[PDB]
Paper text:
The semaphorins are the largest family of evolutionarily conserved axon guidance cues. The semaphorins signal through their main receptors, plexins, which are single-spanning transmembrane proteins expressed in a variety of cell types, including neurons, cancer cells or endothelial cells. We determined crystal structures of Drosophila Sema1a1–2, Sema1b1–2, Sema2a1–3 and Sema2b1–3 to a 3.6-, 2.8-, 2.1- and 2.5 -Å resolution, respectively. All structures contain the sema domain composed of a seven-bladed β-propeller fold, which is followed by a PSI domain.
The secreted semaphorins Sema2a and Sema2b also contain an Ig-like domain positioned C-terminally to their PSI domains. Sema2a and Sema2b are very similar and share over 67% sequence identity. A superposition of Sema2a1–3 and Sema2b1–3 crystal structures unveiled that Sema2a and Sema2b are also highly similar in structure with an rmsd of 1.1 Å over 608 Cα atoms (for Sema2a chain A and Sema2b chain A). Most notable variations are observed in the distribution of charged patches located on their surfaces. On the other hand, when we mutated the equivalent cysteine residue to serine in Sema2afull and Sema2bfull, both proteins partially maintained the homodimeric architecture and a mixture of a monomer and a non-covalent dimer was observed. However, this distinctive glycan is also well-ordered in the Sema1b and Sema2b structures. Within classes, Sema2b binds PlexB ~8 times more strongly than Sema2a. Given the essentially identical architecture of Sema2a and Sema2b, we conclude that their different binding properties either in strength or lifetime of binding to PlexB or interaction with additional co-receptor, determine their distinct functions.
Numbering used by the authors:
A (entry chain A): 40 to 50, 62 to 672
B (entry chain B): 40 to 50, 62 to 670
Write the structure that this text describes.
């Protein structure tokens, strides 16, 4: 009766875009030009970032479908031509080539093909040839189901030349998982200046059935995030571990026989666990996110193995801890029958393997010999505070974006995580500090996609204050703050860091100084004077139904509702549920069966000890 | 008016015995003599097995408290005098010595002491001395919080002599975990005939912080069940594994320098996992149970590590799978920096290590050298069907007992597991077979102890049809079949293997041929003619509350309540839950607000697609 929250967000603060079941995947956001590029099957879209509903299917698209030759070879004798032999876009990157243009790569019917196109989704002139395009190693997956990553890097490579860094698995029939860098071309004079870079082929010490979840350029390096079969666990069982790997941007490879291989490739296990004498590990990373303005923090989701009892967690990682693992001890298995042990630093050659050098071919061979035999660091990368930001049983958390909020006049700084689930929901998790410790609270759960439709991509725009979600059927823009629309109660309003309750107008608003807010729940009872007792009348003998929410908000549905009654000649007491007098509803409601005289009076409803709503009941003689 | 199940069982089918916070622990059940012996702090009781409330505190007890010097020395070491420095009974075993006597061992103020007493809880005459009795060191723990085990064996030991086998800690401050056999005495002539047997002292390959949960004499062996730090896991992290260890009762030890050590000690990991490409392990065994008349099956509880996300499982084991591990390949860590690998059979000496022999000192030294370096088998003992009988998230399962109901027709059988939790509850799980596949069903949950009072011991008397639970505050006898008391509905009655529904009396009775029963849920409409049916009226469109149970039984809250509405103008349709019209009640009810003309009709309540109760709604 009192509180009603409109469902969200699959019913304005929500904008949809769809041209059919085109398997939308791969985001590239250009805030300065109000553009959200979205890849799809045989297509790339340029959506209006401010309001993706204002984009038109026929206008804001560029068709990139395979040739009849590539479709023929892909079908062969037997293969699905319906989606598997289409051109699934997997890479969309900003690329400098006589101005700001887009580098695009697609699966192209199991024949990865890359392109360079204008920002307005037009081809370059037919006479315009871009050096390196269509040549070399496949730059994106052969398979639409492959989990790959890529990042186009303008600065820091050998000779100041641009290059694409990428991790991919190519065909699943063959076993060629690789982290590679494209050939270094001078795009002006067309000369190939340096050969490509790649992990040693078929070396399971470098990659063992990886699934890539992200890649970033930071400082003088490029970092890759993936999960893989844990080689160092084989003597104890089968496990999938999470990895961050690192290469120097200026890596040129070693001497003649190994010049095509990385000379600086290292990787480390990522630690996401609940701390104790027996740490509980979430071993399988699902996605990683970096704030565009912060190159020092990485936020990632991890799950247990999805067989058996399931749990998910969110952990955060500081670049100094990542690099600490790469500056620390190496791991080593001396023989195939040996334990995995740390290497004495006195055994490490000089210069230290993994450090950057302008001329890696000049490094002593002992350095290259060592790094090719010790790609794995001994240290597992420390997660901040040694515990998950957030963890949850029986949920698979996948994509995530992270926002930042500062209230400098009250000295409160919050992170807000938006984390997708395999069921199509978004978790709204706020992080805050209290007495030197980090805490989190699940602020909200809303629906972004039906259960049968997985969330394939998620990104975030600080400029538009919107979250973008891609599924197989549409793209969905969701405002990260819906204070006025979503929260009609002080109770819900003050828990959201974007919001604040205005007791004057009795409504939830975007936060500003002077509004009620308690993200950390450190002033419980702040909403007491904002609970407006609703007076109601009822005749003698008829059934009355008291309820705060029409439907209890999802994040609150598993908390305790306790009702109290205060009438004349009766002290205030808790309402015990009897079969034919007091009934509870799964929404925290109170039903009065056979109302008599003494049933009238004050009724208070508390949720985990905090006052939720109040009623004034009057009963006549009928 | 509604189905009502009264609470159970903390309040004629439940009997209590208590003489104070005496820390009741250690059961020994003598069904032939209607006795349940219970150890306690400084006390041992003999309870009437048929009805433990008949027992009298002052009459059915023998005080066994430490000497004043024992208590003095116990607090000299820095222990707490109130509880730690008392004599906690930890072993009660039947023992032949001029008749049927009892072997008793207690912690005795961190100075383990053992005794031999009569079955009626009286001391033997002081003139009568029992050879070997006196010091309990190696026989029961120093610490009341220790998890130890022991079994007294009359037959199969060297020279036909009796012996106590035990796993415990041999030192109160220093760590000396040991699996141990007492000195072989001839109790008639009083001579010490053979020395004790023990695992090599301080050898982490044999025991590494073990917590023992049971021990049994089976065939020519004694088996020990325990969990311990997983030594073969150290290169990958920290873990606790579950083990079964085995010694030959034959065992006399090797030659002169190692004569005191087992020559036949082997152990193997125990596998309790959900089967898949990535098995999910429950690694920490909590208790093990064997049926008195069956030496081929063992039933155990396993938990994940209690830090982090928690689950518990019940797995069963066949003796042949246990011995298959001991007959299989050995595990080996060649050097301290080596992987753990299986040993080529051609490298194993003869006679095969771990096999029994009348004269183990005669075994070639190479056999003894091998078995002392390779105590751990490569194979992990297969659990039956490769999956838990039953597993549950968010609960810690501890003690368990298992009953067998024999069906005459077609040689079938039900197993009923009674499994305690740390919260004081007993899970009642029936296991049944169908097309050669194993199934289980959680039939009931009831309360045997308050949450803050953990369950310390649990046993089962098939003769009396009762289980017995020991807590710090009391002993509780609970009938395993409470058909008439617990179930007042056909729905609940037919699912319990002990019970059957009688339509003539409209009640639940102990099962006999003719009553309705559907443990396997193969005739879902069996209770349709016996469901709760009633008619209700709603005036002026007031809010109406339909319901079947007073309180939904705990095991039924997991299923989905669905209401169907039959009208002459709307047909039979499932009532869609809409916030402005239809609300759910935590006890399976249906709340119709703003009743109208079209709301009238028949309302059937189904629990997971089985009819629970039906309504006839008319509106005026
Ligand atoms: C992710 O982040 C988590 C949170 O930050 C982090 O949690 C911390 O986890 C640990 C568990 O990993 C918690 O517990 C501690 O565990 C320590 C390690 O103990 C075990 O490991 C020993 C070493 O074995 C490795 O190293 C050998 C030599 O290289 C190899 O031969 C082995 O094969 C093994 O190698 C593996 O691990 C190496 C290091 O990771 C790695 O290089 C290698 O490649 C391979 O992967 C074992 O010797 C030890 O076994 C001994 O002890 C057990 C009893 O537990 C016996 O059963 C065994 O038979 C054996 O004798 C373990 O298997 C412990 O040392 C540590 O103990 C100290 O602290 C506790 C209190 O915290 C004291 O009670 C205890 O007495 C110890 O105190 C003393 O010593 C230490 C140093 O020795 C000293 O600092 C201290 O002041 C005191 O003097 C403790 O139990 C820990 O609590 C967690 N922290 C928090 C804050 O929660 C997690 O590890 C991270 N994960 C990863 C992967 O990094
Ligand atoms: C409890 O009961 C459960 C239910 O009954 C059991 O479940 C079964 O679990 C297994 C997994 O454990 C599932 O199988 C899939 O795994 C197996 C095993 O493969 C892994 O192990 C291989 C061998 O590693 C070990 O032996 C080496 C040789 O001795 C050692 O050098 C090494 O250090 C390992 O040692 C440990 O294990 C052994 C044996 O247990 C032990 O003696 C040691 O002391 C030590 O503890 C590895 O080679 C594999 O690695 C592979 O993957 C790497 C990438 O990560 C590659 O780099 C590498 O080259 C290799 O490819 C794995 O780590 C597979 O054999 C099995 O194969 C499928 O496919 C083959 C194809 O031919 C087929 O023949 C198989 O039948 C199977 O279909 C699977 O991949 C089972 O599915 C599962 N069973 C059921 C019914 O669900 C559980 O095992 C049991 N637990 C215990 C502890 O007993
Ligand atoms: C990818 O590949 C492209 C294409 O090759 C490359 O771009 C080229 O870089 C070179 C090197 O910087 C450029 O060459 C220089 O260009 C400047 C500017 O020239 C134009 O503008 C002037 C007006 O100021 C006109 O007069 C001229 O005709 C051009 O239109 C010149 O000033 C440079 O001249 C010096 O060096 C020449 C030899 O290299 C001499 O012949 C000449 O006399 C000049 O010498 C004087 O200056 C030197 C220092 O600059 C000094 O060392 C001498 O002693 C002497 O004092 C030179 O021609 C070229 O224009 C670029 N081309 C394009 C299309 O941009 C990219 O650099 C490459 N990418 C990467 C990452 O390497
Ligand atoms: C790239 O990375 C992604 C993400 O990490 C990988 O995606 C996993 O991919 C596999 C294979 O495609 C998926 O597994 C499938 O899931 C299907 C949907 O199953 C759910 O829904 C069913 C109802 O329709 C339900 O029955 C099913 O239950 C089963 O799984 C439960 C645990 O997941 C288990 O408890 C149940 O008992 C039961 O076994 C699921 O709830 C299913 O129909 C398929 O048979 C198959 O299982 C995973 O869902 C993907 N995971 C995620 C997080 O998206 C992808 O494989 C990677 N690519 C490569 C090449 O490796
Ligand atoms: C802000 O913080 C306040 C505390 O700092 C919150 O108030 C408290 O909230 C808790 C619940 O989180 C209430 O909890 C109690 O829980 C115990 C134990 O609970 C368990 O056992 C029962 C019985 O089996 C089981 O049913 C439950 O599910 C639990 O597993 C109960 O015994 C108590 O009766 C009570 O329910 C506190 O009562 C409550 N008040 C105080 C003063 O602690 C407050 O809700 C927070 N506000 C927010 C988050 O908006
Ligand atoms: C022998 O085996 C036993 C069973 O496996 C082992 O038992 C474990 O013993 C430890 C320590 O004695 C217990 O840990 C403690 O739990 C208590 C009480 O916990 C409960 O109450 C608190 C509130 O007071 C609540 O927060 C918890 O959630 C519990 O509800 C704590 O107060 C202690 O600080 C400590 O954490 C284990 O709980 C217990 N586990 C089980 C399954 O019984 C025993 O340790 C073994 N003996 C030896 C010598 O190792
Ligand atoms: C623990 O110690 C107990 C006390 O000694 C053992 O019990 C004793 O067992 C012996 C059996 O050897 C038993 O003796 C029997 O034989 C005696 C002599 O008999 C022989 O002599 C006749 C004629 O002299 C000859 O023809 C036969 O071939 C044979 O060689 C008899 O005098 C005696 O009455 C009896 O028949 C002892 O009586 C018995 N002692 C007691 C107190 O029971 C016990 O065996 C041992 N436990 C184990 C497991 O070894
Ligand atoms: C005895 O066995 C029958 C046959 O399985 C049980 O009926 C079935 O119960 C399951 C749930 O255990 C029902 O499944 C569910 O369907 C809903 C709606 O589609 C879905 O949301 C759930 O995820 C689940 O899949 C199933 O519909 C139902 N079958 C029929 C015909 O009603 C019955 O509950 C068992 N009875 C007892 C007392 O165990
Ligand atoms: C985002 O764009 C869509 C489409 O242009 C807007 O939807 C329209 O809303 C106006 C006024 O509310 C109507 O007159 C149109 O008929 C709507 N068009 C469609 C296709 O529904 C939407 O309002 C825009 N949202 C924002 C926040 O500007
Ligand atoms: C088990 O023994 C208890 C204790 O003797 C019985 O409880 C008593 O029942 C008798 C009647 O048989 C009453 O006279 C006593 O007042 C009861 N005492 C208590 C403390 O309850 C109990 O009835 C016996 N149960 C069975 C099944 O024999
Ligand atoms: C407890 O049991 C012992 C052992 O049977 C009893 O002691 C016997 O008492 C009878 C007399 O009734 C004597 O003839 C035996 O010689 C005794 N045997 C021993 C080994 O002492 C004792 O009387 C019993 N006590 C009670 C109270 O029943
Ligand atoms: C390495 O290259 C950078 C950039 O070209 C340059 O500034 C630096 O001086 C070089 N250092 C050496 C030692 O060659
Ligand atoms: C071992 O002793 C038992 C009984 O003591 C006997 O039956 C068996 O034959 C003996 N075996 C050998 C090899 O002496």
């Amino acid at each position: 009766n009192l509180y009603y929250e409109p469902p969200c967000c699959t019913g304005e603060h929500v904008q949809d875009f769809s041209c059919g079941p085109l398997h939308y995947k791969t985001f590239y956001m250009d805030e300065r030009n109000n553009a959200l590029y979205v890849g799809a099957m045989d297509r790339i879209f340029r959506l209006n970032l401010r309001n993706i509903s204002q984009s038109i299917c026929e206008r804001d698209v560029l068709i990139l479908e395979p040739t009849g030759s590539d479709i023929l070879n892909c079908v062969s004798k037997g293969k699905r031509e319906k989606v598997e032999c289409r051109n699934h876009i997997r890479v969309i990157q900003p690329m400098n080539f006589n101005g700001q243009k887009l580098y695009v790569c697609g699966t192209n019917a199991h024949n990865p093909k890359d392109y360079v196109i204008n920002a307005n989704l037009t081809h370059l002139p037919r006479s315009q040839y871009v050096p390196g395009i269509g040549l070399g190693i496949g730059k994106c997956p052969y398979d639409p189901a492959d989990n790959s990553t890529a990042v186009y890097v303008e600065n820091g490579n050998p000779f100041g030349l641009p290059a694409l860094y990428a991790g991919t698995n190519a065909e699943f029939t063959k076993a060629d998982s690789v982290i590679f860098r494209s050939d270094l071309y001078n795009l002006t004079n067309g000369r190939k200046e340096a050969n490509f870079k790649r992990t040693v082929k078929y070396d399971s010490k470098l990659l063992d059935k990886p699934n890539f979840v992200g890649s970033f350029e930071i400082g003088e390096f490029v970092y890759f995030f993936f999960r893989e079969h844990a080689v160092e666990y084989i003597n104890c069982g089968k496990a999938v571990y999470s990895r961050v790997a690192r290469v120097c941007k200026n890596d040129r490879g070693g001497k003649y026989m190994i010049s095509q291989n990385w000379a600086t490739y290292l990787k480390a296990r990522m630690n996401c666990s609940i701390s104790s004498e027996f740490p509980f590990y979430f071993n399988e990373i699902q996605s990683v996110y970096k704030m565009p303005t912060d190159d020092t923090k990485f936020y990632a989701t991890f799950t247990t193995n999805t067989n058996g009892l399931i749990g998910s967690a969110v952990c955060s990682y500081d670049i100094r801890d990542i690099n600490a693992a790469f500056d620390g001890k190496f791991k080593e298995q001396a023989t195939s029958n040996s334990a995995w042990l740390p290497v004495l630093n006195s055994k490490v050659p000089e210069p230290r393997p993994g450090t950057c050098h302008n001329d890696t071919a000049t490094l002593p061979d002992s350095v290259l010999n060592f790094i090719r035999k010790h790609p794995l660091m001994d240290k597992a990368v420390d997660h901040e505070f040694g515990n998950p930001v957030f963890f949850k049983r029986d949920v698979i958390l996948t994509k995530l974006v992270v926002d930042k909020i500062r209230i400098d006049k009250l000295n409160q700084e919050f992170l807000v995580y938006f984390v997708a689930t395999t069921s199509g929901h978004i978790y709204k998790i706020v992080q805050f500090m209290h007495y030197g410790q980090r805490h989190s609270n699940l602020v909200d759960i809303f629906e972004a996609s039906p259960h049968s439709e997985p969330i394939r991509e998620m990104t975030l725009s600080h400029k538009t204050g919107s979250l973008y979600v891609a599924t197989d059927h549409q793209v969905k823009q969701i405002d990260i703050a819906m204070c006025a629309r979503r929260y009609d109660s002080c109770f819900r309003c003050v828990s959201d860091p974007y919001c604040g309750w205005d007791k004057d107008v009795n409504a939830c608003r975007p936060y500003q100084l002077g509004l009620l807010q308690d993200v950390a729940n450190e002033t419980s009872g702040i909403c007491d004077t904002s609970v407006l007792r609703k007076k109601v009348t009822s005749s003698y003998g008829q059934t009355l139904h008291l309820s705060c929410f029409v439907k209890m908000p999802e994040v609150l549905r598993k908390k305790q509702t306790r009702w109290y009654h205060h009438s004349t000649e009766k002290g205030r007491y808790e309402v015990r549920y009897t079969p034919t007098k007091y009934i509870d509803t799964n929404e925290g409601g109170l039903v009065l069966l056979a109302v008599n005289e003494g049933d009238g009076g004050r009724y208070d409803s508390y949720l985990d000890g905090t006052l939720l709503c109040s009623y004034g009941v009057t009963v006549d003689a009928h």
